[PDB]
PDB file of all heavy atoms in Angstrom:
ATOM      1  N   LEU A   4      30.972   8.218 -20.551  1.00 13.46           N
ATOM      2  CA  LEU A   4      30.909   9.197 -19.478  1.00 13.46           C
ATOM      3  C   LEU A   4      29.701   8.914 -18.594  1.00 13.46           C
ATOM      4  O   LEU A   4      28.666   8.427 -19.069  1.00 13.46           O
ATOM      5  CB  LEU A   4      30.772  10.614 -20.070  1.00 13.46           C
ATOM      6  CG  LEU A   4      31.877  11.053 -21.023  1.00 13.46           C
ATOM      7  CD1 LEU A   4      31.640  12.503 -21.481  1.00 13.46           C
ATOM      8  CD2 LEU A   4      33.276  10.868 -20.414  1.00 13.46           C
ATOM      9  N   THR A   6      27.618  11.151 -15.216  1.00 12.75           N
ATOM     10  CA  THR A   6      27.645  12.324 -14.344  1.00 12.75           C
ATOM     11  C   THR A   6      26.753  12.139 -13.141  1.00 12.75           C
ATOM     12  O   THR A   6      25.631  11.644 -13.273  1.00 12.75           O
ATOM     13  CB  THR A   6      27.203  13.545 -15.210  1.00 12.75           C
ATOM     14  OG1 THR A   6      28.161  13.683 -16.272  1.00 12.75           O
ATOM     15  CG2 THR A   6      27.161  14.826 -14.423  1.00 12.75           C
ATOM     16  N   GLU A  42       7.139  17.066   6.667  1.00 27.03           N
ATOM     17  CA  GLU A  42       7.711  17.765   5.517  1.00 27.03           C
ATOM     18  C   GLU A  42       8.172  19.155   5.983  1.00 27.03           C
ATOM     19  O   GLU A  42       7.544  19.758   6.877  1.00 27.03           O
ATOM     20  CB  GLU A  42       6.677  17.974   4.415  1.00 27.03           C
ATOM     21  CG  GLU A  42       5.875  16.742   4.055  1.00 27.03           C
ATOM     22  CD  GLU A  42       6.641  15.549   3.539  1.00 27.03           C
ATOM     23  OE1 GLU A  42       7.884  15.623   3.422  1.00 27.03           O
ATOM     24  OE2 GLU A  42       5.968  14.522   3.262  1.00 27.03           O
ATOM     25  N   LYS A  46      11.763  29.102   2.481  1.00 37.18           N
ATOM     26  CA  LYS A  46      11.861  30.209   1.537  1.00 37.18           C
ATOM     27  C   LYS A  46      12.396  31.369   2.375  1.00 37.18           C
ATOM     28  O   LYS A  46      12.654  31.191   3.569  1.00 37.18           O
ATOM     29  CB  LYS A  46      10.499  30.474   0.854  1.00 37.18           C
ATOM     30  CG  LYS A  46      10.450  31.543  -0.258  1.00 37.18           C
ATOM     31  CD  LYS A  46      11.552  31.414  -1.336  1.00 37.18           C
ATOM     32  CE  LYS A  46      11.720  32.683  -2.118  1.00 37.18           C
ATOM     33  NZ  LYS A  46      13.003  32.653  -2.868  1.00 37.18           N
ATOM     34  N   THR A  47      12.668  32.523   1.756  1.00 38.31           N
ATOM     35  CA  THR A  47      13.238  33.651   2.490  1.00 38.31           C
ATOM     36  C   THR A  47      12.584  33.824   3.843  1.00 38.31           C
ATOM     37  O   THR A  47      11.365  34.010   3.938  1.00 38.31           O
ATOM     38  CB  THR A  47      13.030  34.925   1.688  1.00 38.31           C
ATOM     39  OG1 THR A  47      13.408  34.680   0.322  1.00 38.31           O
ATOM     40  CG2 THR A  47      13.807  36.114   2.259  1.00 38.31           C
ATOM     41  N   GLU A  55       2.229  15.077   9.500  1.00 38.67           N
ATOM     42  CA  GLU A  55       1.472  14.296  10.462  1.00 38.67           C
ATOM     43  C   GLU A  55       2.407  13.603  11.423  1.00 38.67           C
ATOM     44  O   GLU A  55       3.306  12.865  11.010  1.00 38.67           O
ATOM     45  CB  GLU A  55       0.566  13.261   9.752  1.00 38.67           C
ATOM     46  CG  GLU A  55      -0.303  13.883   8.651  1.00 38.67           C
ATOM     47  CD  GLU A  55       0.425  14.077   7.331  1.00 38.67           C
ATOM     48  OE1 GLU A  55       1.293  13.254   6.968  1.00 38.67           O
ATOM     49  OE2 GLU A  55       0.124  15.093   6.661  1.00 38.67           O
ATOM     50  N   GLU A  96      -0.431  17.914  12.227  1.00 26.32           N
ATOM     51  CA  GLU A  96      -1.590  17.281  12.845  1.00 26.32           C
ATOM     52  C   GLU A  96      -1.226  15.848  13.190  1.00 26.32           C
ATOM     53  O   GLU A  96      -0.109  15.402  12.909  1.00 26.32           O
ATOM     54  CB  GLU A  96      -2.802  17.311  11.902  1.00 26.32           C
ATOM     55  CG  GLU A  96      -3.432  18.678  11.767  1.00 26.32           C
ATOM     56  CD  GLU A  96      -4.445  18.768  10.646  1.00 26.32           C
ATOM     57  OE1 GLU A  96      -5.627  18.466  10.895  1.00 26.32           O
ATOM     58  OE2 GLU A  96      -4.067  19.166   9.526  1.00 26.32           O
ATOM     59  N   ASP A 101      -7.270   6.659   9.782  1.00 21.87           N
ATOM     60  CA  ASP A 101      -7.515   5.647   8.750  1.00 21.87           C
ATOM     61  C   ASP A 101      -6.226   4.941   8.349  1.00 21.87           C
ATOM     62  O   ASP A 101      -6.216   3.722   8.160  1.00 21.87           O
ATOM     63  CB  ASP A 101      -8.203   6.275   7.547  1.00 21.87           C
ATOM     64  CG  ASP A 101      -9.612   6.768   7.820  1.00 21.87           C
ATOM     65  OD1 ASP A 101     -10.152   6.462   8.918  1.00 21.87           O
ATOM     66  OD2 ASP A 101     -10.190   7.421   6.934  1.00 21.87           O
ATOM     67  N   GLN A 104      -5.102   2.743  11.602  1.00 22.07           N
ATOM     68  CA  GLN A 104      -5.821   1.474  11.774  1.00 22.07           C
ATOM     69  C   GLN A 104      -5.453   0.435  10.705  1.00 22.07           C
ATOM     70  O   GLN A 104      -5.479  -0.773  10.982  1.00 22.07           O
ATOM     71  CB  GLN A 104      -7.343   1.721  11.849  1.00 22.07           C
ATOM     72  CG  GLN A 104      -8.037   2.217  10.569  1.00 22.07           C
ATOM     73  CD  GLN A 104      -8.249   1.139   9.522  1.00 22.07           C
ATOM     74  OE1 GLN A 104      -8.591  -0.009   9.832  1.00 22.07           O
ATOM     75  NE2 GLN A 104      -7.977   1.442   8.260  1.00 22.07           N
ATOM     76  N   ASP A 119       2.754   2.432   3.426  1.00  9.88           N
ATOM     77  CA  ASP A 119       2.275   2.913   2.149  1.00  9.88           C
ATOM     78  C   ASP A 119       2.556   1.827   1.148  1.00  9.88           C
ATOM     79  O   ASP A 119       3.315   0.888   1.415  1.00  9.88           O
ATOM     80  CB  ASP A 119       3.026   4.207   1.750  1.00  9.88           C
ATOM     81  CG  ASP A 119       2.345   5.073   0.706  1.00  9.88           C
ATOM     82  OD1 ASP A 119       1.279   4.654   0.156  1.00  9.88           O
ATOM     83  OD2 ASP A 119       2.855   6.177   0.444  1.00  9.88           O
ATOM     84  N   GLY A 121       4.397   1.200  -2.622  1.00  3.70           N
ATOM     85  CA  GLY A 121       5.514   1.825  -3.303  1.00  3.70           C
ATOM     86  C   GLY A 121       6.544   0.834  -3.743  1.00  3.70           C
ATOM     87  O   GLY A 121       6.485  -0.353  -3.378  1.00  3.70           O
ATOM     88  N   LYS A 166      26.612  23.436  -4.594  1.00  2.00           N
ATOM     89  CA  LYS A 166      26.329  22.300  -5.484  1.00  2.00           C
ATOM     90  C   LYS A 166      27.604  21.905  -6.180  1.00  2.00           C
ATOM     91  O   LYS A 166      28.434  22.774  -6.509  1.00  2.00           O
ATOM     92  CB  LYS A 166      25.250  22.643  -6.537  1.00  2.00           C
ATOM     93  CG  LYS A 166      23.937  23.132  -5.917  1.00  2.00           C
ATOM     94  CD  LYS A 166      22.837  23.327  -6.955  1.00  2.00           C
ATOM     95  CE  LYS A 166      22.294  22.036  -7.524  1.00  2.00           C
ATOM     96  NZ  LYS A 166      21.150  22.330  -8.464  1.00  2.00           N
ATOM     97  N   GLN A 168      29.227  18.772  -9.188  1.00  2.00           N
ATOM     98  CA  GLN A 168      28.839  17.795 -10.184  1.00  2.00           C
ATOM     99  C   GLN A 168      30.091  17.234 -10.794  1.00  2.00           C
ATOM    100  O   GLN A 168      30.984  17.992 -11.188  1.00  2.00           O
ATOM    101  CB  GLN A 168      27.962  18.451 -11.267  1.00  2.00           C
ATOM    102  CG  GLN A 168      27.276  17.417 -12.172  1.00  2.00           C
ATOM    103  CD  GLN A 168      26.372  18.142 -13.120  1.00  2.00           C
ATOM    104  OE1 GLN A 168      25.208  18.422 -12.811  1.00  2.00           O
ATOM    105  NE2 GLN A 168      26.913  18.505 -14.277  1.00  2.00           N
ATOM    106  N   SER A 232      28.118  30.515 -12.936  1.00  2.00           N
ATOM    107  CA  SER A 232      27.119  31.569 -13.093  1.00  2.00           C
ATOM    108  C   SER A 232      27.752  32.957 -12.962  1.00  2.00           C
ATOM    109  O   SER A 232      27.097  33.948 -13.286  1.00  2.00           O
ATOM    110  CB  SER A 232      26.024  31.435 -12.044  1.00  2.00           C
ATOM    111  OG  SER A 232      26.533  31.811 -10.765  1.00  2.00           O
ATOM    112  N   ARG A 234      28.283  34.813 -10.309  1.00  2.00           N
ATOM    113  CA  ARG A 234      27.932  35.516  -9.072  1.00  2.00           C
ATOM    114  C   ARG A 234      26.878  34.722  -8.357  1.00  2.00           C
ATOM    115  O   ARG A 234      25.859  34.337  -8.970  1.00  2.00           O
ATOM    116  CB  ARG A 234      27.422  36.934  -9.377  1.00  2.00           C
ATOM    117  CG  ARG A 234      27.079  37.699  -8.115  1.00  2.00           C
ATOM    118  CD  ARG A 234      26.621  39.115  -8.435  1.00  2.00           C
ATOM    119  NE  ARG A 234      25.956  39.735  -7.291  1.00  2.00           N
ATOM    120  CZ  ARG A 234      26.591  40.473  -6.381  1.00  2.00           C
ATOM    121  NH1 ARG A 234      27.897  40.725  -6.507  1.00  2.00           N
ATOM    122  NH2 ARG A 234      25.928  40.986  -5.355  1.00  2.00           N
ATOM    123  N   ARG A 249      13.407  16.532  -2.257  1.00  2.00           N
ATOM    124  CA  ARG A 249      13.700  17.067  -3.568  1.00  2.00           C
ATOM    125  C   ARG A 249      15.144  16.813  -4.003  1.00  2.00           C
ATOM    126  O   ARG A 249      15.608  17.370  -5.000  1.00  2.00           O
ATOM    127  CB  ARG A 249      13.307  18.545  -3.666  1.00  2.00           C
ATOM    128  CG  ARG A 249      11.778  18.720  -3.848  1.00  2.00           C
ATOM    129  CD  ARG A 249      11.301  18.470  -5.306  1.00  2.00           C
ATOM    130  NE  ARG A 249      11.842  19.504  -6.171  1.00  2.00           N
ATOM    131  CZ  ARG A 249      11.230  20.641  -6.476  1.00  2.00           C
ATOM    132  NH1 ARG A 249       9.955  20.831  -6.133  1.00  2.00           N
ATOM    133  NH2 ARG A 249      11.878  21.592  -7.134  1.00  2.00           N
ATOM    134  N   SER A 314       6.786  -7.874  -4.424  1.00  2.00           N
ATOM    135  CA  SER A 314       7.732  -8.336  -5.426  1.00  2.00           C
ATOM    136  C   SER A 314       9.129  -8.014  -4.959  1.00  2.00           C
ATOM    137  O   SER A 314       9.345  -7.069  -4.181  1.00  2.00           O
ATOM    138  CB  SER A 314       7.470  -7.672  -6.781  1.00  2.00           C
ATOM    139  OG  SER A 314       7.785  -6.281  -6.808  1.00  2.00           O
ATOM    140  N   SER A 316      13.106  -8.168  -7.070  1.00  2.00           N
ATOM    141  CA  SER A 316      13.747  -8.416  -8.340  1.00  2.00           C
ATOM    142  C   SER A 316      15.203  -8.050  -8.308  1.00  2.00           C
ATOM    143  O   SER A 316      15.596  -7.151  -7.559  1.00  2.00           O
ATOM    144  CB  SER A 316      13.039  -7.634  -9.439  1.00  2.00           C
ATOM    145  OG  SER A 316      11.624  -7.797  -9.327  1.00  2.00           O
TER     146      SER A 316
ATOM    147  N   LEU B   4       9.919 -10.169 -12.323  1.00  2.00           N
ATOM    148  CA  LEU B   4       8.853  -9.232 -12.003  1.00  2.00           C
ATOM    149  C   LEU B   4       9.388  -7.807 -12.056  1.00  2.00           C
ATOM    150  O   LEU B   4      10.563  -7.557 -11.754  1.00  2.00           O
ATOM    151  CB  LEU B   4       8.320  -9.511 -10.584  1.00  2.00           C
ATOM    152  CG  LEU B   4       7.783 -10.915 -10.333  1.00  2.00           C
ATOM    153  CD1 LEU B   4       7.231 -11.026  -8.901  1.00  2.00           C
ATOM    154  CD2 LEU B   4       6.740 -11.333 -11.380  1.00  2.00           C
ATOM    155  N   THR B   6       7.753  -3.731 -10.844  1.00  2.00           N
ATOM    156  CA  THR B   6       6.601  -2.994 -10.327  1.00  2.00           C
ATOM    157  C   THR B   6       6.730  -1.513 -10.587  1.00  2.00           C
ATOM    158  O   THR B   6       7.808  -0.944 -10.401  1.00  2.00           O
ATOM    159  CB  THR B   6       6.508  -3.308  -8.801  1.00  2.00           C
ATOM    160  OG1 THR B   6       6.303  -4.724  -8.668  1.00  2.00           O
ATOM    161  CG2 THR B   6       5.370  -2.586  -8.131  1.00  2.00           C
ATOM    162  N   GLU B  42       6.945  26.489  -6.447  1.00  2.00           N
ATOM    163  CA  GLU B  42       6.671  25.285  -5.664  1.00  2.00           C
ATOM    164  C   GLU B  42       5.295  25.448  -5.000  1.00  2.00           C
ATOM    165  O   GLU B  42       4.903  26.575  -4.636  1.00  2.00           O
ATOM    166  CB  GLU B  42       7.694  25.093  -4.550  1.00  2.00           C
ATOM    167  CG  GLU B  42       9.138  25.236  -4.981  1.00  2.00           C
ATOM    168  CD  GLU B  42       9.641  24.276  -6.031  1.00  2.00           C
ATOM    169  OE1 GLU B  42       8.864  23.410  -6.491  1.00  2.00           O
ATOM    170  OE2 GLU B  42      10.836  24.416  -6.399  1.00  2.00           O
ATOM    171  N   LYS B  46      -1.615  21.134   2.600  1.00  2.00           N
ATOM    172  CA  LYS B  46      -1.941  20.415   3.824  1.00  2.00           C
ATOM    173  C   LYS B  46      -3.390  20.805   4.114  1.00  2.00           C
ATOM    174  O   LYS B  46      -3.986  21.557   3.338  1.00  2.00           O
ATOM    175  CB  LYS B  46      -0.938  20.758   4.950  1.00  2.00           C
ATOM    176  CG  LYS B  46      -1.070  19.997   6.286  1.00  2.00           C
ATOM    177  CD  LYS B  46      -1.190  18.461   6.153  1.00  2.00           C
ATOM    178  CE  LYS B  46      -1.737  17.833   7.402  1.00  2.00           C
ATOM    179  NZ  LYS B  46      -2.183  16.444   7.119  1.00  2.00           N
ATOM    180  N   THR B  47      -4.003  20.231   5.155  1.00  2.00           N
ATOM    181  CA  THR B  47      -5.406  20.516   5.449  1.00  2.00           C
ATOM    182  C   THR B  47      -5.720  21.987   5.292  1.00  2.00           C
ATOM    183  O   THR B  47      -5.112  22.840   5.952  1.00  2.00           O
ATOM    184  CB  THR B  47      -5.708  20.110   6.882  1.00  2.00           C
ATOM    185  OG1 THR B  47      -5.169  18.796   7.115  1.00  2.00           O
ATOM    186  CG2 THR B  47      -7.206  20.143   7.199  1.00  2.00           C
ATOM    187  N   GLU B  55       9.994  31.638  -6.981  1.00  2.00           N
ATOM    188  CA  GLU B  55      10.522  32.807  -7.661  1.00  2.00           C
ATOM    189  C   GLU B  55       9.929  32.920  -9.044  1.00  2.00           C
ATOM    190  O   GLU B  55      10.015  31.986  -9.847  1.00  2.00           O
ATOM    191  CB  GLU B  55      12.067  32.758  -7.739  1.00  2.00           C
ATOM    192  CG  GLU B  55      12.727  32.490  -6.380  1.00  2.00           C
ATOM    193  CD  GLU B  55      12.749  31.022  -5.986  1.00  2.00           C
ATOM    194  OE1 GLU B  55      12.885  30.142  -6.863  1.00  2.00           O
ATOM    195  OE2 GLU B  55      12.607  30.759  -4.770  1.00  2.00           O
ATOM    196  N   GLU B  96       8.642  35.610  -4.755  1.00  2.00           N
ATOM    197  CA  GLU B  96       9.488  36.775  -4.987  1.00  2.00           C
ATOM    198  C   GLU B  96      10.001  36.719  -6.415  1.00  2.00           C
ATOM    199  O   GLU B  96       9.706  35.770  -7.148  1.00  2.00           O
ATOM    200  CB  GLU B  96      10.664  36.807  -3.999  1.00  2.00           C
ATOM    201  CG  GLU B  96      10.264  37.189  -2.592  1.00  2.00           C
ATOM    202  CD  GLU B  96      11.357  36.962  -1.571  1.00  2.00           C
ATOM    203  OE1 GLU B  96      12.177  37.877  -1.374  1.00  2.00           O
ATOM    204  OE2 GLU B  96      11.381  35.882  -0.946  1.00  2.00           O
ATOM    205  N   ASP B 101      21.137  37.265  -9.293  1.00  2.00           N
ATOM    206  CA  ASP B 101      22.398  36.552  -9.515  1.00  2.00           C
ATOM    207  C   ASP B 101      22.212  35.385 -10.477  1.00  2.00           C
ATOM    208  O   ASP B 101      23.058  35.151 -11.345  1.00  2.00           O
ATOM    209  CB  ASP B 101      22.986  36.093  -8.189  1.00  2.00           C
ATOM    210  CG  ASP B 101      23.440  37.222  -7.283  1.00  2.00           C
ATOM    211  OD1 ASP B 101      23.471  38.393  -7.752  1.00  2.00           O
ATOM    212  OD2 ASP B 101      23.799  36.941  -6.126  1.00  2.00           O
ATOM    213  N   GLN B 104      21.398  37.055 -14.112  1.00  2.00           N
ATOM    214  CA  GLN B 104      22.570  37.557 -14.844  1.00  2.00           C
ATOM    215  C   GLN B 104      23.479  36.429 -15.351  1.00  2.00           C
ATOM    216  O   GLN B 104      24.128  36.579 -16.396  1.00  2.00           O
ATOM    217  CB  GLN B 104      23.339  38.587 -13.989  1.00  2.00           C
ATOM    218  CG  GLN B 104      24.050  38.063 -12.729  1.00  2.00           C
ATOM    219  CD  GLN B 104      25.339  37.314 -13.012  1.00  2.00           C
ATOM    220  OE1 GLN B 104      26.133  37.693 -13.881  1.00  2.00           O
ATOM    221  NE2 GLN B 104      25.554  36.184 -12.351  1.00  2.00           N
ATOM    222  N   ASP B 119      20.379  25.762 -14.376  1.00  2.00           N
ATOM    223  CA  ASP B 119      20.962  25.105 -13.228  1.00  2.00           C
ATOM    224  C   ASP B 119      21.925  24.080 -13.762  1.00  2.00           C
ATOM    225  O   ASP B 119      21.914  23.748 -14.953  1.00  2.00           O
ATOM    226  CB  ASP B 119      19.859  24.410 -12.394  1.00  2.00           C
ATOM    227  CG  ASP B 119      20.220  24.085 -10.956  1.00  2.00           C
ATOM    228  OD1 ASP B 119      21.406  24.300 -10.554  1.00  2.00           O
ATOM    229  OD2 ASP B 119      19.325  23.634 -10.219  1.00  2.00           O
ATOM    230  N   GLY B 121      22.880  19.959 -13.445  1.00  2.00           N
ATOM    231  CA  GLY B 121      22.095  18.771 -13.173  1.00  2.00           C
ATOM    232  C   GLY B 121      22.269  17.717 -14.221  1.00  2.00           C
ATOM    233  O   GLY B 121      22.885  17.959 -15.273  1.00  2.00           O
ATOM    234  N   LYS B 166      -4.180   5.949  -5.491  1.00  2.00           N
ATOM    235  CA  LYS B 166      -2.882   5.361  -5.854  1.00  2.00           C
ATOM    236  C   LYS B 166      -3.120   3.995  -6.439  1.00  2.00           C
ATOM    237  O   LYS B 166      -4.038   3.275  -6.001  1.00  2.00           O
ATOM    238  CB  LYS B 166      -1.936   5.245  -4.636  1.00  2.00           C
ATOM    239  CG  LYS B 166      -1.700   6.583  -3.928  1.00  2.00           C
ATOM    240  CD  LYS B 166      -0.655   6.482  -2.821  1.00  2.00           C
ATOM    241  CE  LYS B 166       0.758   6.296  -3.326  1.00  2.00           C
ATOM    242  NZ  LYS B 166       1.723   6.306  -2.166  1.00  2.00           N
ATOM    243  N   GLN B 168      -0.801   0.436  -8.298  1.00  2.00           N
ATOM    244  CA  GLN B 168       0.513  -0.157  -8.444  1.00  2.00           C
ATOM    245  C   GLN B 168       0.355  -1.453  -9.184  1.00  2.00           C
ATOM    246  O   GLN B 168      -0.504  -2.270  -8.833  1.00  2.00           O
ATOM    247  CB  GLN B 168       1.148  -0.403  -7.063  1.00  2.00           C
ATOM    248  CG  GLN B 168       2.643  -0.742  -7.156  1.00  2.00           C
ATOM    249  CD  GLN B 168       3.190  -0.861  -5.768  1.00  2.00           C
ATOM    250  OE1 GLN B 168       3.606   0.128  -5.154  1.00  2.00           O
ATOM    251  NE2 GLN B 168       3.149  -2.074  -5.229  1.00  2.00           N
ATOM    252  N   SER B 232      -5.764  -0.997   2.948  1.00  2.00           N
ATOM    253  CA  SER B 232      -5.726  -0.422   4.290  1.00  2.00           C
ATOM    254  C   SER B 232      -7.056  -0.626   5.020  1.00  2.00           C
ATOM    255  O   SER B 232      -7.118  -0.400   6.229  1.00  2.00           O
ATOM    256  CB  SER B 232      -5.431   1.070   4.229  1.00  2.00           C
ATOM    257  OG  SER B 232      -6.572   1.767   3.730  1.00  2.00           O
ATOM    258  N   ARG B 234      -9.767   1.220   5.059  1.00  2.00           N
ATOM    259  CA  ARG B 234     -10.553   2.446   5.225  1.00  2.00           C
ATOM    260  C   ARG B 234      -9.717   3.611   4.779  1.00  2.00           C
ATOM    261  O   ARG B 234      -8.553   3.749   5.214  1.00  2.00           O
ATOM    262  CB  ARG B 234     -10.983   2.624   6.691  1.00  2.00           C
ATOM    263  CG  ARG B 234     -11.824   3.869   6.890  1.00  2.00           C
ATOM    264  CD  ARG B 234     -12.278   4.002   8.337  1.00  2.00           C
ATOM    265  NE  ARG B 234     -12.771   5.347   8.623  1.00  2.00           N
ATOM    266  CZ  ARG B 234     -14.051   5.702   8.508  1.00  2.00           C
ATOM    267  NH1 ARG B 234     -14.975   4.802   8.162  1.00  2.00           N
ATOM    268  NH2 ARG B 234     -14.424   6.949   8.762  1.00  2.00           N
ATOM    269  N   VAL B 236     -11.228   7.177   4.235  1.00  2.00           N
ATOM    270  CA  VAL B 236     -12.220   8.286   4.190  1.00  2.00           C
ATOM    271  C   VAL B 236     -11.464   9.611   4.220  1.00  2.00           C
ATOM    272  O   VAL B 236     -11.769  10.518   3.412  1.00  2.00           O
ATOM    273  CB  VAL B 236     -13.247   8.143   5.336  1.00  2.00           C
ATOM    274  CG1 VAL B 236     -14.171   9.371   5.425  1.00  2.00           C
ATOM    275  CG2 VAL B 236     -14.066   6.873   5.119  1.00  2.00           C
ATOM    276  N   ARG B 249       7.408  15.597  -5.831  1.00  2.00           N
ATOM    277  CA  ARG B 249       7.486  14.432  -4.979  1.00  2.00           C
ATOM    278  C   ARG B 249       6.935  13.172  -5.646  1.00  2.00           C
ATOM    279  O   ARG B 249       6.748  12.143  -4.991  1.00  2.00           O
ATOM    280  CB  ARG B 249       6.850  14.701  -3.611  1.00  2.00           C
ATOM    281  CG  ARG B 249       7.786  15.532  -2.698  1.00  2.00           C
ATOM    282  CD  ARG B 249       8.910  14.685  -2.037  1.00  2.00           C
ATOM    283  NE  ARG B 249       8.314  13.742  -1.105  1.00  2.00           N
ATOM    284  CZ  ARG B 249       8.126  13.966   0.189  1.00  2.00           C
ATOM    285  NH1 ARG B 249       8.653  15.045   0.769  1.00  2.00           N
ATOM    286  NH2 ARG B 249       7.421  13.111   0.917  1.00  2.00           N
ATOM    287  N   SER B 314      27.896  16.462 -20.786  1.00  2.00           N
ATOM    288  CA  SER B 314      28.048  15.061 -21.139  1.00  2.00           C
ATOM    289  C   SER B 314      26.753  14.566 -21.731  1.00  2.00           C
ATOM    290  O   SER B 314      25.668  15.096 -21.437  1.00  2.00           O
ATOM    291  CB  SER B 314      28.415  14.218 -19.914  1.00  2.00           C
ATOM    292  OG  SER B 314      27.357  14.091 -18.967  1.00  2.00           O
ATOM    293  N   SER B 316      25.308  10.422 -22.747  1.00  2.00           N
ATOM    294  CA  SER B 316      25.640   9.018 -22.678  1.00  2.00           C
ATOM    295  C   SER B 316      24.478   8.153 -23.073  1.00  2.00           C
ATOM    296  O   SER B 316      23.324   8.546 -22.882  1.00  2.00           O
ATOM    297  CB  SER B 316      26.097   8.662 -21.269  1.00  2.00           C
ATOM    298  OG  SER B 316      27.040   9.627 -20.798  1.00  2.00           O
TER     299      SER B 316
END
Side-chain angles (χ1 to χ4, degrees):
Chain A
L4 302 183
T6 299
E42 312 299 0
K46 185 49 198 165
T47 313
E55 309 81 34
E96 287 169 88
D101 293 350
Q104 68 76 40
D119 200 355
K166 304 186 71 176
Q168 192 176 273
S232 72
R234 181 178 165 92
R249 282 281 294 268
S314 70
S316 313
Chain B
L4 302 183
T6 299
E42 312 299 0
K46 185 49 198 165
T47 313
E55 309 81 34
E96 287 169 88
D101 293 350
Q104 68 76 40
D119 200 355
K166 304 186 71 176
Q168 192 176 273
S232 72
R234 181 178 165 92
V236 173
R249 282 281 294 268
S314 70
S316 313

